Amino acid sequence: KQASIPAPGSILSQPNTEQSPAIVLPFQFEATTFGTAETAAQVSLQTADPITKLTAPYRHAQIVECKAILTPTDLAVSNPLTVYLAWVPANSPATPTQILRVYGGQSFVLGGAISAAKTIEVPLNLDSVNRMLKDSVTYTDTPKLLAYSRAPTNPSKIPTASIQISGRIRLSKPMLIAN
Amino acid sequence: KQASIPAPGSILSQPNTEQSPAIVLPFQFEATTFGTAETAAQVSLQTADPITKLTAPYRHAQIVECKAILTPTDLAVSNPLTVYLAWVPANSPATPTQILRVYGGQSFVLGGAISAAKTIEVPLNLDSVNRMLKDSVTYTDTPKLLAYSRAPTNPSKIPTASIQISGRIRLSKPMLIAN
Amino acid sequence: KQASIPAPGSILSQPNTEQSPAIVLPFQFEATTFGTAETAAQVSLQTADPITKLTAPYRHAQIVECKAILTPTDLAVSNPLTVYLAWVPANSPATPTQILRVYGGQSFVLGGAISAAKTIEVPLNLDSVNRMLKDSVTYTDTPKLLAYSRAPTNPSKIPTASIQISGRIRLSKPMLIAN
Amino acid sequence: MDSSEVVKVKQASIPAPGSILSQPNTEQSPAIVLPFQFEATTFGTAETAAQVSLQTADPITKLTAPYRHAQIVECKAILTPTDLAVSNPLTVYLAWVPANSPATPTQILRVYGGQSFVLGGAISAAKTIEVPLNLDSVNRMLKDSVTYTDTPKLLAYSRAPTNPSKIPTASIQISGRIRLSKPMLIAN
Amino acid sequence: MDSSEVVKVKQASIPAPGSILSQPNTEQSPAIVLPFQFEATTFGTAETAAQVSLQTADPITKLTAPYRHAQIVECKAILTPTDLAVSNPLTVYLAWVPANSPATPTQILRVYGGQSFVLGGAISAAKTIEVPLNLDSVNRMLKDSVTYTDTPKLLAYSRAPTNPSKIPTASIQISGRIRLSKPMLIAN
Amino acid sequence: MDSSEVVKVKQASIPAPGSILSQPNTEQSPAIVLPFQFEATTFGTAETAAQVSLQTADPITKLTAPYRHAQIVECKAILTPTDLAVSNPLTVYLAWVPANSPATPTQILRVYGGQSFVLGGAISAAKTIEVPLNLDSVNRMLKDSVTYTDTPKLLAYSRAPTNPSKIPTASIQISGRIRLSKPMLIAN
């Protein structure tokens, strides 16, 4: 009844290396936006500063859930824009232009065209990439989103979208950073 | 068969302190609106006058359900506006500007952009805050919604939205107020 | 414990001919588009270059899932267009004009008329065609989509839609192509 | 026969762990072990007689930021001398006390477990010294739904250096591990 | 963290204790184990005829008053060599004698127990000594209906240094706990 | 022949190890436990931002090449005070961190493990310290089909001496053994 009720209680996880119980740390950010410029950036769900800014204190991490929504700002109503999306590992020559031609090809508009409430909400199939966001090894099959818009005559400066990739991820095995 | 069919029948609840069976008292109000001004207020699901105007007669209370919908008034059709939303405890430096960058980041438009029927409906995860709306102690991890809009050239006075936080909450343990 | 844990492990499929375990190879492409021309093409889910460009290395293949979505480009907002869709085998005199009159008849608009997020998403009932995309025999009851739009005064060159038929398909029995 | 270059020292204390606000119902969620170590304060530079609180120590908190619940597990108050300590001795007056102890750094001495450490000179072989944060004379928790006192506060002190130096003659680099659990949301 | 570590030195074993008053029947009041530590003496600033008797030890007595049954749990005297003693050694004398023993700080060496100590200068003389008052010799009791004679008296000595340093070359303190009971009927 | 003898000091226990690649079936190649020891760093001639990672440790790597499966058996870092340090003491910092931990030699003290050491000057500071890399933290593996991230990185530091002595006032080396296997298909 002293210090054993119940003494232990270790129910750690194991994505690729059995380590202490990883805590599901969620995140939200826009690796790339599209509004007043030829949108065409290829960001990965691994090199992203935000993710790397939370997985550094540890050694290994495995994304348990990831998404990508498009939030059309107050603009786009008078200056619409077609945002292209698609999920694919770091590998594969899947270029922004090759979008739509690759499984998971998405394409919507902004303004009077259904784009506001309920958001776009584009989940990422873990069966299409790798969960190991960071490990002792170097995985090349890591998640990676694609985006394109071209942006016609919309020199309104302020972006018309946001394109944020959220989700949660577990991380274990300390890395003893600065502190 | 007199006064015992079935004599007792006490099935009280227990959020943090076993007390008499709390009654689920629902509520609906707009802690803050956004239409013709730089919307940027940080209201909490604890200090709100309405809630405190119903939890006063008691001592402890635990929110069993909370939400936040945006109802675009007759306006916003000619003067749209982007309403930002996000749920987070009283703690965390999550500022209105930090919105979207925090888990649960929302952002929709008004007018021709999907915003009318079905409402926005943004529930609050109890696993992100604290149920104890009010207790003998002082909880800092209490729910708190965020809002932003900036509001461009929309000096139509009348608000374009409402942003109301509804939901239900149980309260027990009398507080013997004025009467 | 050497090379038998568990030695075999053959769990192949069988659509019409028992062969090695077929791998579900997904695909995405627009057999035909509609924007600035009298849209009226009858493409089949068998003769399509893309499909035939992935089923060639094999002998037999059976579509396990197929779809057809319409992604309205940045245009169509000022120059809307009605896209007609319908699924039907290679047989049947189901012509583009006969659309809507045939089971599975679809018809939507573009622009201010619900057409952007969530996409159209028009699945194909395997109980209406044949799974055998390619086999030792010649099937005539193979899937086939229909499209029509007419296209009024929309000489904007760039298409207003895309009409892409995605889905997955299993293929077995090598065909020993060039390499 | 052998050799050890580190001296440990317990801070006498009387049991006094404060009241901890409980777990929800049906226990808790996953948790992580998070070691940390930080330069608490230095001496030799000037009369560096200050104090530190774990409940607010930047390096600690940094690791605490993402969680809204985290009880300390182990904590070491360590004193590490530099070559300078040899040429010019520095005395540190350590003491671990809860947020409620009115104790000023100077008072160190008259506070039960306060200690005095010479360090350097020549008499001294001069080595590392650890003084254990007696977690039971404090509220183990640092960031929790309910904020409070009794939280871990380190004392330590030193008078004006006979002969100063822009390099610490010595420095207390406290450490430990925290049981971080339950998310803070924020992120960014 | 454990090399020159212990340094707790014991004093001559007076086989004898000290009888006190009796305790009556009925139930007994509650008890509080309140700890204490107070600066007792300096050293090295002048010739110090150190002789403290906890019996009238302001700091501890600042705990006694509110109750009328003070009983020393145990305690010890700390010899804290100052940064000064390192370079400026000194011979500290020390003793635990009952408040009746006609022993002046000076006669320490002469009384069965005389603790001889030298701080700084010589190797490891940097280290601090903890000398225990193993109750038996005095009255485990400290305050009640009667005042006793066998209260403990910590006495120590050192003559004036060549340089009665601006501040102490050393330090001595008295630390222990007290079982406080029989609350004082009082005003509020 | 055994007085100041041991002097092997341990570093902060990262409870964690480091996952590596898997091994296939069939029989495995032979193994050779080839030992190694190579001068890693100097000290005392200037400000030394010492940080070696065995992963690219020339000397050990001079053993790797002929085989394609290098696995560190274990190893340690030696702190060898030079005749110079005796009279010219110095504060050596030291740490064993995985090749990913963003820790610069300087931040050693800040990273959970920071080894503080002083050579010469003070008593017995003459002696040599052996600090072990208790595998668990990094990859017990060192070379194969893939290059890993959790390779060990020995890092240490000391600022420039008043006299950046002609030669080192100290010395550091890395010693251990390696299980070499999977001979490299090669030319002769």
PDB file of C-alpha atoms in Angstrom, chain A residues 49-147:
ATOM      1  CA  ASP A  49      11.061  23.739 -39.020  1.00  0.00           C
ATOM      2  CA  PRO A  50       8.056  23.354 -36.674  1.00  0.00           C
ATOM      3  CA  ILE A  51       8.244  19.553 -36.551  1.00  0.00           C
ATOM      4  CA  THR A  52      12.036  19.595 -36.262  1.00  0.00           C
ATOM      5  CA  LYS A  53      11.539  22.226 -33.558  1.00  0.00           C
ATOM      6  CA  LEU A  54       9.713  19.681 -31.401  1.00  0.00           C
ATOM      7  CA  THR A  55      11.373  16.400 -32.374  1.00  0.00           C
ATOM      8  CA  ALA A  56      14.874  17.688 -31.635  1.00  0.00           C
ATOM      9  CA  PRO A  57      14.723  17.126 -27.845  1.00  0.00           C
ATOM     10  CA  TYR A  58      14.206  13.457 -28.720  1.00  0.00           C
ATOM     11  CA  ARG A  59      15.868  10.865 -30.952  1.00  0.00           C
ATOM     12  CA  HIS A  60      12.998   8.985 -32.591  1.00  0.00           C
ATOM     13  CA  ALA A  61       9.438   9.984 -33.485  1.00  0.00           C
ATOM     14  CA  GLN A  62       6.526   8.523 -35.443  1.00  0.00           C
ATOM     15  CA  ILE A  63       3.669  10.574 -36.888  1.00  0.00           C
ATOM     16  CA  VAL A  64       0.405   8.983 -35.753  1.00  0.00           C
ATOM     17  CA  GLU A  65      -1.775  11.465 -37.632  1.00  0.00           C
ATOM     18  CA  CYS A  66      -1.301  14.218 -40.213  1.00  0.00           C
ATOM     19  CA  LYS A  67      -3.572  16.490 -42.251  1.00  0.00           C
ATOM     20  CA  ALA A  68      -3.685  19.518 -44.550  1.00  0.00           C
ATOM     21  CA  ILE A  69      -6.451  22.125 -44.700  1.00  0.00           C
ATOM     22  CA  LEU A  70      -6.866  25.272 -46.793  1.00  0.00           C
ATOM     23  CA  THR A  71      -8.249  28.384 -45.106  1.00  0.00           C
ATOM     24  CA  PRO A  72      -9.208  31.054 -47.683  1.00  0.00           C
ATOM     25  CA  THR A  73      -8.610  34.468 -46.108  1.00  0.00           C
ATOM     26  CA  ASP A  74     -11.018  37.396 -46.423  1.00  0.00           C
ATOM     27  CA  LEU A  75      -9.702  37.682 -49.977  1.00  0.00           C
ATOM     28  CA  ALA A  76     -10.092  35.138 -52.788  1.00  0.00           C
ATOM     29  CA  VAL A  77     -13.718  36.288 -52.956  1.00  0.00           C
ATOM     30  CA  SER A  78     -12.915  38.798 -55.695  1.00  0.00           C
ATOM     31  CA  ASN A  79      -9.642  37.114 -56.651  1.00  0.00           C
ATOM     32  CA  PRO A  80     -10.223  33.326 -56.532  1.00  0.00           C
ATOM     33  CA  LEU A  81      -7.409  30.789 -56.884  1.00  0.00           C
ATOM     34  CA  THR A  82      -7.179  27.042 -57.490  1.00  0.00           C
ATOM     35  CA  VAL A  83      -5.134  25.262 -54.823  1.00  0.00           C
ATOM     36  CA  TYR A  84      -3.675  21.868 -55.739  1.00  0.00           C
ATOM     37  CA  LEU A  85      -2.869  19.276 -53.069  1.00  0.00           C
ATOM     38  CA  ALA A  86      -1.560  15.709 -52.851  1.00  0.00           C
ATOM     39  CA  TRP A  87       0.248  13.466 -50.368  1.00  0.00           C
ATOM     40  CA  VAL A  88       3.362  11.499 -51.311  1.00  0.00           C
ATOM     41  CA  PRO A  89       6.649  10.370 -49.696  1.00  0.00           C
ATOM     42  CA  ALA A  90       9.892  12.322 -50.093  1.00  0.00           C
ATOM     43  CA  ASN A  91      10.741   9.978 -52.962  1.00  0.00           C
ATOM     44  CA  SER A  92       8.832   9.684 -56.244  1.00  0.00           C
ATOM     45  CA  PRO A  93       9.281  12.361 -58.949  1.00  0.00           C
ATOM     46  CA  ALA A  94       5.830  13.662 -57.994  1.00  0.00           C
ATOM     47  CA  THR A  95       6.264  17.324 -58.926  1.00  0.00           C
ATOM     48  CA  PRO A  96       3.726  20.116 -58.243  1.00  0.00           C
ATOM     49  CA  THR A  97       2.821  20.021 -61.937  1.00  0.00           C
ATOM     50  CA  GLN A  98       2.421  16.242 -61.788  1.00  0.00           C
ATOM     51  CA  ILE A  99      -0.333  16.885 -59.244  1.00  0.00           C
ATOM     52  CA  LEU A 100      -3.765  15.348 -59.887  1.00  0.00           C
ATOM     53  CA  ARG A 101      -1.972  12.698 -61.949  1.00  0.00           C
ATOM     54  CA  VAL A 102      -0.819  11.157 -58.670  1.00  0.00           C
ATOM     55  CA  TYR A 103      -3.095   9.259 -56.284  1.00  0.00           C
ATOM     56  CA  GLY A 104      -4.674  11.639 -53.797  1.00  0.00           C
ATOM     57  CA  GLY A 105      -4.820  14.448 -56.323  1.00  0.00           C
ATOM     58  CA  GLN A 106      -6.989  17.285 -55.041  1.00  0.00           C
ATOM     59  CA  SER A 107      -8.107  20.591 -56.558  1.00  0.00           C
ATOM     60  CA  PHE A 108     -10.597  23.161 -55.278  1.00  0.00           C
ATOM     61  CA  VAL A 109     -11.370  26.858 -55.716  1.00  0.00           C
ATOM     62  CA  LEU A 110     -11.956  29.836 -53.426  1.00  0.00           C
ATOM     63  CA  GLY A 111     -14.693  32.425 -53.011  1.00  0.00           C
ATOM     64  CA  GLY A 112     -18.167  31.666 -54.306  1.00  0.00           C
ATOM     65  CA  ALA A 113     -16.925  28.125 -54.881  1.00  0.00           C
ATOM     66  CA  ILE A 114     -17.386  25.968 -51.767  1.00  0.00           C
ATOM     67  CA  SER A 115     -14.406  27.006 -49.640  1.00  0.00           C
ATOM     68  CA  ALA A 116     -14.907  28.325 -46.106  1.00  0.00           C
ATOM     69  CA  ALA A 117     -16.760  26.429 -43.377  1.00  0.00           C
ATOM     70  CA  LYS A 118     -15.932  22.777 -42.659  1.00  0.00           C
ATOM     71  CA  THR A 119     -12.556  23.505 -44.274  1.00  0.00           C
ATOM     72  CA  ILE A 120     -10.988  21.252 -46.905  1.00  0.00           C
ATOM     73  CA  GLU A 121      -9.548  18.685 -44.490  1.00  0.00           C
ATOM     74  CA  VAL A 122      -7.171  16.440 -46.438  1.00  0.00           C
ATOM     75  CA  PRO A 123      -5.852  13.580 -44.257  1.00  0.00           C
ATOM     76  CA  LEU A 124      -2.620  11.712 -44.989  1.00  0.00           C
ATOM     77  CA  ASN A 125      -2.609   7.936 -45.441  1.00  0.00           C
ATOM     78  CA  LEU A 126       0.167   6.415 -43.338  1.00  0.00           C
ATOM     79  CA  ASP A 127       0.036   3.499 -45.776  1.00  0.00           C
ATOM     80  CA  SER A 128       1.506   5.820 -48.408  1.00  0.00           C
ATOM     81  CA  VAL A 129       4.551   7.055 -46.491  1.00  0.00           C
ATOM     82  CA  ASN A 130       6.579   6.383 -43.340  1.00  0.00           C
ATOM     83  CA  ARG A 131       5.664   7.045 -39.710  1.00  0.00           C
ATOM     84  CA  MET A 132       9.285   7.401 -38.598  1.00  0.00           C
ATOM     85  CA  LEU A 133       9.516  11.194 -38.713  1.00  0.00           C
ATOM     86  CA  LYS A 134      13.020  10.908 -37.272  1.00  0.00           C
ATOM     87  CA  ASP A 135      15.141   7.943 -36.189  1.00  0.00           C
ATOM     88  CA  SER A 136      18.699   6.646 -35.872  1.00  0.00           C
ATOM     89  CA  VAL A 137      18.461   5.905 -39.594  1.00  0.00           C
ATOM     90  CA  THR A 138      17.632   8.047 -42.628  1.00  0.00           C
ATOM     91  CA  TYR A 139      14.202   7.306 -44.100  1.00  0.00           C
ATOM     92  CA  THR A 140      13.423   8.600 -47.593  1.00  0.00           C
ATOM     93  CA  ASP A 141       9.801   7.441 -47.664  1.00  0.00           C
ATOM     94  CA  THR A 142       8.759  10.266 -45.336  1.00  0.00           C
ATOM     95  CA  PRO A 143       5.488  12.190 -45.894  1.00  0.00           C
ATOM     96  CA  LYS A 144       5.476  15.221 -48.197  1.00  0.00           C
ATOM     97  CA  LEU A 145       2.703  17.517 -49.425  1.00  0.00           C
ATOM     98  CA  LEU A 146       2.526  19.272 -52.794  1.00  0.00           C
ATOM     99  CA  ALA A 147       0.969  22.602 -53.767  1.00  0.00           C
TER     100      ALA A 147
END
